[PDB]
Paper text:
Both models were completed manually using Coot interspersed with refinement with REFMAC5.
In all three cases diffraction images were indexed and integrated using XDS and reduced using AIMLESS.
Numbering used by the authors: 2 to 315
């Protein structure tokens, strides 16, 4: 309990931004402006969660140790705004659930995750990753898992799990475009491999660039990565890219319909048609139905959904 205040800080990539805080003796990373609040915690290099609600003596967040917290807090706010403004959705559950994030998780931890209840961000080892909350697509990817878990409930294995992952990359990217800094169709480029320019974890525009399939005939069928959830997601990421941006892929031509309509179609599919066990063929059907609901059965939008899924062999 305290009074809402506005702090200032520097994020992982060195940019200054304002952050919404709460004052009660200390200034806490607690944003009361969005739903039931956005709360950012210090995990203090340990794996106990959530850790301590982030406290600061002066409401200025320019220390090196502060940067991952500033970005986890700020980009959760951006993500909240995207869902509210674009999709009329109030937080991940649709009922303004509090959004909780922990930073400084463990030592040298080269990942981030939604744990069923909150977001968690490693600092990276400084070679593979820098602190992972520095990437707006990463923050939005993880918070999108919460959305999925409350809605379609896609099981984290095999084709359902690859859809789960792709939904997170799709909305992660749409949020990155909403914020409009340096948007692209790549995943994690701002925090991956600080020694190497121009790479990323995954690509939506060309998944094969990083060894991921861009066609159903190239799907991974083994047991690694929960049946390739971060690998086979490339097939869906490519379809989504094609629906938005257009192109000819394996000789199948897709007329792009743009990002806003992509987001509308997939948000509707996610929230009205997908189920925990949906597979790729079922996703196609859900996307075709959603586009039909939104734009009509004779629409270009529907035609493009069908061409995009044809192009990737679904
Ligand atoms: N988030 C992906 C890629 C990160 C790999 C980090 N070492 C995964 O959990 O598989
Ligand atoms: C690192 C991040 C984008 C995610 N947890 C994987 O993929
Ligand atoms: Ca301070
Ligand atoms: Ca970018
Ligand atoms: Ca990106
Ligand atoms: Ca890099
Ligand atoms: Zn994920």
């Amino acid at each position: 309990t305290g009074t809402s205040t506005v702090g200032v800080g520097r994020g992982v990539l060195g940019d200054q931004k304002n952050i919404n805080t709460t004052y009660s003796t200390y200034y806490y990373l607690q944003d009361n402006t969005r739903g039931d609040g956005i709360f950012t915690y210090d995990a203090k290099y340990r794996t106990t969660l959530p850790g301590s609600l982030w406290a600061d003596a002066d409401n200025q967040f320019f220390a090196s140790y502060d940067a991952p917290a500033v970005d986890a807090h700020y980009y959760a706010g951006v993500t909240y705004d995207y869902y509210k403004n674009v999709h009329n959705r109030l937080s991940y559950d649709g009922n303004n659930a509090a959004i909780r994030s922990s930073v400084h998780y463990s030592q040298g931890y080269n990942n981030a995750f939604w744990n069923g209840s909150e977001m968690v961000y490693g600092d990276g080892d400084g070679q593979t990753f820098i602190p992972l909350s520095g990437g707006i697509d990463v923050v939005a990817h993880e918070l999108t898992h919460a959305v999925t878990d409350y809605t379609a409930g896609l099981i984290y294995q095999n084709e359902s799990g690859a859809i789960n992952e792709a939904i997170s990359d799709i909305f992660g990217t749409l949020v990155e475009f909403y914020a409009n800094k340096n948007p692209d169709w790549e995943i994690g480029e701002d925090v991956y491999t600080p020694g190497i320019s121009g790479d990323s974890l995954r690509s939506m525009s060309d998944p094969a660039k990083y060894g991921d399939p861009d066609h159903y005939s190239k799907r991974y069928t083994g047991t690694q990565d929960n049946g390739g959830v971060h690998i086979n997601s490339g097939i869906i990421n490519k379809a989504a890219y094609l629906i938005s941006q257009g192109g000819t892929h394996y000789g199948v031509s897709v007329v792009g319909i743009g990002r806003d309509k992509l987001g509308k179609i997939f948000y509707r599919a996610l929230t009205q048609y997908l189920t925990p066990t949906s597979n790729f063929s079922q996703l196609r059907a859900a996307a075709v139905q959603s586009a039909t609901d939104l734009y009509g059965s004779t629409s270009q939008e529907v035609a493009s959904v069908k061409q995009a899924f044809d192009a990737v062999g679904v």
